[PDB]
From Swiss-Prot:
It is found in: Golgi apparatus, Golgi stack membrane; Secreted. The keyword Manganese applies. An alpha-L-fucosyl-(1->2)-beta-D-galactosyl derivative binds at residues 154, 166, 221, 244. Belongs to the glycosyltransferase 6 family. This is Histo-blood group ABO system transferase. Glycans are attached at residue 52. Mn(2+) binds at residues 132, 134. The chain holds residues 64 to 345 of 354 of the full protein. The active site is at residue 221. It catalyses: an alpha-L-fucosyl-(1->2)-beta-D-galactosyl derivative + UDP-N-acetyl-alpha-D-galactosamine = an N-acetyl-alpha-D-galactosaminyl-(1->3)-[alpha-L-fucosyl-(1->2)]-beta-D-galactosyl derivative + UDP + H(+); an alpha-L-fucosyl-(1->2)-beta-D-galactosyl derivative + UDP-alpha-D-galactose = an alpha-D-galactosyl-(1->3)-[alpha-L-fucosyl-(1->2)]-beta-D-galactosyl derivative + UDP + H(+). Changing residue 119 to W: In allele Aw07. Changing residue 155 to A: In allele B(A). One of its GO terms (molecular function) is fucosylgalactoside 3-alpha-galactosyltransferase activity. Keywords: Blood group antigen, Glycoprotein, Glycosyltransferase, Golgi apparatus, Manganese, Membrane, Metal-binding, Secreted, Signal-anchor, Transferase, Transmembrane, Transmembrane helix.
Amino acid sequence: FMVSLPRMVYPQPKVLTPCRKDVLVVTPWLAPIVWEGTFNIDILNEQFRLQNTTIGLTVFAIKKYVAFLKLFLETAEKHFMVGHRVHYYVFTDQPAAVPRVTLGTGRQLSVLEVRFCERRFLSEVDYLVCVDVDMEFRDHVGVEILTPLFGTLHPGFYGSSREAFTYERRPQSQAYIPKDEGDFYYLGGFFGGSVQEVQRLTRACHQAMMVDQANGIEHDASHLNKYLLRHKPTKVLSPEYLWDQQLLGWPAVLRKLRFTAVP
Ligand SMILES: [Hg+2]
Ligand SMILES: [Hg+2]
Ligand SMILES: [Hg+2]
Ligand SMILES: [Hg+2]
């Protein structure tokens, strides 16, 4: 049950004026492709606040990567889902090395040591967002991404033909994608969706990985890409949501760099 939106004043959408004339803003299966300019965040924020949405943000910070947590969480506090309930889950082998970062109200952090758990996510959050920790939020990352299942366009392949995508190409692998298949090349550093859809993804990925290991063949990205080929995501994030400015600059087609590699 979705309650009524309030009165809001904003510019009328123009049916005969395309949103962007430089990029694809919807997939062939009618999933939006989220670029700056495609969304009114005020409408979306209302929609998700009225549902009292809670978002889990999972990071794995092992060994030397704990060094990146401080900048990651600090910048998340400024840019990630500001205004909504956020639950950080930091998986680490060094719980004591996790920095004390000050969190805004309605936001919490759990440290989970690694050397009825998945069940925990189902009762605690509505969506899960899984990302790499050696990263920095530089601009808005908000509820526009939220959907049952989403992937993010790999920043070095978003203009490439499918032949050039570095999918798994060996037929013996469960991640195998032939040269004549593939919609996009998704990167493993930013994906998510509902808790249910994310658990299905990681479960299917874990089983495919074990089958490959059993067949003497050896990763994350290739399996994610196979999964999202066969289970089309309900939104697709533009490379705004995972960029490397040192490696790729700031091209015109990116009006914002939201989430980036660290110099
Ligand atoms: Hg638009
Ligand atoms: Hg995750
Ligand atoms: Hg992840
Ligand atoms: Hg996966």
